Amino acid sequence: ARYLGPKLKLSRREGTDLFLKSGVRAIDTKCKIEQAPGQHGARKPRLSDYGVQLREKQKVRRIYGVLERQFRNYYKEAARLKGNTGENLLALLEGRLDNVVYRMGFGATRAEARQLVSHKAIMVNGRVVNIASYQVSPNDVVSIREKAKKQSRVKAALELAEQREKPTWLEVDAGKMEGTFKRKPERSDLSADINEHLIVELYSK
Amino acid sequence: NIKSAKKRAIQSEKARKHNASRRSMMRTFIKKVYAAIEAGDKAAAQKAFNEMQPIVDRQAAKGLIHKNKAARHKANLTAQINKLA
Amino acid sequence: KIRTLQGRVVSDKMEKSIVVAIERFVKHPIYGKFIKRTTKLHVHDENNECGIGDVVEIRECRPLSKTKSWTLVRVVEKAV
Amino acid sequence: MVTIRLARHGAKKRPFYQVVVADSRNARNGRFIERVGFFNPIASEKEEGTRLDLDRIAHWVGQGATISDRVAALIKEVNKAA
RNA sequence: AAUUGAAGAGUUUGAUCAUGGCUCAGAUUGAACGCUGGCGGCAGGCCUAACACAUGCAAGUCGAACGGUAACAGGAAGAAGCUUGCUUCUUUGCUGACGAGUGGCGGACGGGUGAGUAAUGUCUGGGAAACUGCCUGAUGGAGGGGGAUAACUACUGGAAACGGUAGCUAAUACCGCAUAACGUCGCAAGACCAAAGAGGGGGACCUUCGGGCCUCUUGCCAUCGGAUGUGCCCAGAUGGGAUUAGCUAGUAGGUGGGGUAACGGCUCACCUAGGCGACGAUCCCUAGCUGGUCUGAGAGGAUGACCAGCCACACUGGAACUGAGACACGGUCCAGACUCCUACGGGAGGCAGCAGUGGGGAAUAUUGCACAAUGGGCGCAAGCCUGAUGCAGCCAUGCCGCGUGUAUGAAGAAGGCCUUCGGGUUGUAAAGUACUUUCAGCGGGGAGGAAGGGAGUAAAGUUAAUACCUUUGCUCAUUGACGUUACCCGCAGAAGAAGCACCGGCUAACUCCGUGCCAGCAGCCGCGGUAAUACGGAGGGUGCAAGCGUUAAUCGGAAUUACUGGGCGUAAAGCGCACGCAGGCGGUUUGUUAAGUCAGAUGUGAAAUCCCCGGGCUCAACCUGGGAACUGCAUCUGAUACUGGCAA
């Protein structure tokens, strides 16, 4: 399923930072960013109109760590759901359980916070849930189990997470390590960078 | 064939020899009426009709005749006796 | 109330029987044009009270022969 | 003979019986005249486990209809107070 | 709330715009094949030979119908061995029960297959002339006899299959009489027609000592209903071919007799000379049909595997019997081919039930467990039966979910590759270091699918009866194939777990070496003639991921059959030109009709599916509640502008 590879080569192919690493520092400047994704890295291409639609879909797919069969089912459920299907696809990607626990600060990366929720450690509404792709509804409280609480990793990501922009569609206490998903995140709160309409145009091709 | 319900196969043919005796005696009293109305016998057909009418209705009660065929045999024969004379 | 249909007589020469064509005005499934279709039936009459080419109103009855399941009701617009 | 019996639908190890009015000669999931409710045996202690339209069931037993042992049990189980 | 839904590209030329094919990017599949391969969930799994089948199993049940006793377990006697209070053993249907037999019911259901079938089918909507076991409602009846026959003995034919003679015996088997109706026939008068008893308990009384007698349950018979199932008819719709144009004598119609549960040339005789057909009859080829599925923006196109409805078939062909229901998958009889047995006279068999074998094929699985659940047959029940069904095995066949770690980490290690020889890339990648244990593995806990049924007790009902039975409660002991289940908890250790295609344009992703129109690639343009981003290898990169590519097939793109939605001066395309029948269409005004049309209502359009809002599985796939939808058809009631009819 998952990538299980070098997670800065993916950020160099897209150019921008995908927040795939914890970032105790800033740009690591140990990775040669914005210069070369490969051997022919100085050779920048024409990047045609199909390719600019492919790069934006592969950018969003590499942030959350989903695969294409799982991503195409996200688009398919976003198109039939009422409203703007551009921000409906992002409300479902930000409704993932491994993403919400990242934005609450309990994981330093997406792949680290996926390993917490996959290892039977994180419960929703007082019930233990095991998967990464659990769609959380509004006013659901997600807690951390006491056997994996006090884990030399979960609070260590919490003092790292004051610089992570304070996502204000969910309130986090982080002393008791609980948090509720208040409402769905609107389009005006997601990074101002991704062009979701290129993803809707790529699957209509 | 190798069942235990081949008893039904030997039960069916002894009901066939029972029914074919009753069915042939049922319609040979009908043949007494049809042979009488062709000869012009008015009174001899009426006494022959009165001997098949207990016969054809008793077989309708046993299940050999449906009671719609036994009613059909009495209907067209009285329609055949009265048009004779 | 009885379901009944109109229709004109095509032929009559069959000894207490007449045949009757019924014109229905149906629309095409694909093209949407309205096409006249024909419903030639063998209908029953008693004493031959119908020549050729006149409107006869019919209603459905018990089967009277092989392809004869309709009897006459009345005759309007008798042939001249 | 019309029978009011359970037609087992639902997935493997997760049964879901439809309280249905079918002729006795037909199959279990085969033809029927009417369905008059359902029965969920695995719906354990949550909100809702069984529902039977008892007016239509009482209509069919007035016409003459045998009922199965489970259908006779669910009609008993919708009690006078419960 | 029940839809928010429509992309193009390459290639004719020196170049161009058109026209016009070809090809590609998409989705899908009962898939196959190649490489690869961790787990789980829910599904799916001979598409070809409707070819041939070894073996097991798939339909039995009822003693509360009957004669009974071949076993089984007791009891009662008779013996005698002895343990003198315990034995072995002979009678007894005396009981519990029950082989065989008669009888009742089922075997026509469930299951499988798609050969035939182009309409004797199916779908939708109507109709009348029908039947209908079990179920249920109502009203009544249920009297009195008779003659048999299997079983069982005695004998006998045959190798067997299967018989033959003689003598017995019962019934809810069979037959008659009585008795009848709102039943059948008939205008009426009249005439005629049925049955069957068992079981539990019982006070008083007869008690020939078995029982009569009382009560309850249950079955029987007739008629009329209801419900259900089925038979029949009509209209419309449901494939291709006109290089198939005429077809049909029981044919078309009438009358009359006969048949059917019922209408009918269904059948027969006699009369009439019709009937179908260019709106495609007839003939030929192909084919199960539908709800649906796939695709598509839709209209459409293709399709009918799974699930569900209907039909057809059961070695091939033909036939009827029994029965409420069959012209009968695991019935009969006949013929045929095939296989087997035989004492050569004669017999036996039918997997398109489940599993399986051979064969065919590109290809499709276990000779498994259990009646626990849900159904079905039988039974008063207890129960028995059930390859239906519930599960298990096999298979990446499909869809869905998860894992193969996470975070730091620059000596930018070594190594590989490239270089302009400076470096660059592989690459935070690894190593190192710090953590985590899902899943798999090892132990320990542990739901739910279980409702009932049995025993006992109490109450009510019934009755002469606190008896019995029925009903309602309560108590006790129990009933799970799956299954060392889902799930939860504990232990250990980054430990058990990543491929496949591609990198010239289309089309996301490039350099080096080898080869030199060779070997080869290729879906289309086309690459390869010594400096190949196109061949083979290496490094790098891109795509998708327990899969990935290839082939096959369908739709899309294709507006490239154009109803939506195309064209015909020169690109393909106006008949050489007229006249004219059927057909299609029709100026204008008024009246009328309500057919087309439109509005409303009603019945129906099965369920599943699709869609919408919810619910249950840790989410999802999956399951499920309700609604929408099922563009339809039919009837009824209005509207009268337009179209049509009619009249002027």
Curated annotation (Swiss-Prot), chain A:
Residues 95-155 form the S4 RNA-binding domain. GO terms for molecular function: mRNA 5'-UTR binding; mRNA regulatory element binding translation repressor activity; rRNA binding; structural constituent of ribosome. It comes from the Bacteria. Changing Y50D: In rpsD101; suppresses a temperature-sensitive mutant of release factor 1, R137P. Not a ram mutation. GO terms for cellular component: cytoplasm; cytosol; cytosolic small ribosomal subunit; small ribosomal subunit. Transmembrane segments: none annotated. Keywords: Antibiotic resistance, Repressor, Ribonucleoprotein, Ribosomal protein, Ribosome biogenesis, RNA-binding, rRNA-binding, Transcription, Transcription antitermination, Transcription regulation, Transcription termination, Translation regulation. PROSITE patterns: RIBOSOMAL_S4 (PS00632), S4 (PS50889). GO terms for biological process: cytoplasmic translation; DNA-templated transcription termination; maintenance of translational fidelity; negative regulation of translational initiation; response to antibiotic; ribosomal small subunit assembly; ribosomal small subunit biogenesis; transcription antitermination. Gene3D superfamilies: Ribosomal Protein S4 Delta 41, Chain A, domain 1, RNA-binding S4 domain. Belongs to the universal ribosomal protein uS4 family. One of two assembly initiator proteins for the 30S subunit, it binds directly to 16S rRNA where it nucleates assembly of the body of the 30S subunit. PANTHER family: 30S 40S RIBOSOMAL PROTEIN (PTHR11831), SMALL RIBOSOMAL SUBUNIT PROTEIN US4M (PTHR11831:SF4).
From Swiss-Prot, chain B:
It comes from the Bacteria. Residues 1-24 are annotated as: Disordered. The keyword ATP-binding does not apply. One of its GO terms (cellular component) is cytoplasm. GO terms for molecular function: ornithine decarboxylase inhibitor activity; small ribosomal subunit rRNA binding; structural constituent of ribosome. GO terms for biological process: cytoplasmic translation; ribosomal small subunit assembly. Part of the 30S ribosomal subunit. Belongs to the bacterial ribosomal protein bS20 family. Binds directly to 16S ribosomal RNA. This is Small ribosomal subunit protein bS20. It comes from Escherichia coli (strain K12). The gene is rpsT.
Swiss-Prot record, chain C:
GO terms for molecular function: rRNA binding; small ribosomal subunit rRNA binding; structural constituent of ribosome; zinc ion binding. Gene3D superfamilies: Nucleic acid-binding proteins. Disulfide bonds: none annotated. Pfam families: Ribosomal_S17. Keywords: Antibiotic resistance, Ribonucleoprotein, Ribosomal protein, RNA-binding, rRNA-binding. GO terms for biological process: cytoplasmic translation; response to antibiotic; ribosomal small subunit assembly. It comes from the Bacteria. GO terms for cellular component: cytoplasm; cytosolic small ribosomal subunit. HAMAP family: Ribosomal_uS17_B (MF_01345_B). Belongs to the universal ribosomal protein uS17 family. Part of the 30S ribosomal subunit. The strain missing both S17 and L29 grows very slowly and has a rather unstable temperature-sensitive phenotype. One of the primary rRNA binding proteins, it binds specifically to the 5'-end of 16S ribosomal RNA. Also plays a role in translational accuracy; neamine-resistant ribosomes show reduced neamine-induced misreading in vitro. This is Small ribosomal subunit protein uS17.
UniProtKB/Swiss-Prot annotation, chain D:
Keywords: Endonuclease, Hydrolase, Nuclease, Ribonucleoprotein, Ribosomal protein. One of its GO terms (cellular component) is small ribosomal subunit. GO terms for molecular function: DNA endonuclease activity; four-way junction DNA binding; structural constituent of ribosome. In addition to being a ribosomal protein, S16 also has a cation-dependent endonuclease activity. NCBIfam families: S16. The keyword Chloroplast does not apply. Induction: Part of the rpsP-rimM-trmD-rplS operon. It comes from the Bacteria. GO terms for biological process: cytoplasmic translation; ribosomal small subunit assembly. This is Small ribosomal subunit protein bS16. Belongs to the bacterial ribosomal protein bS16 family. Part of the 30S ribosomal subunit. The keyword Ribosomal protein applies. Pfam families: Ribosomal_S16 (PF00886).
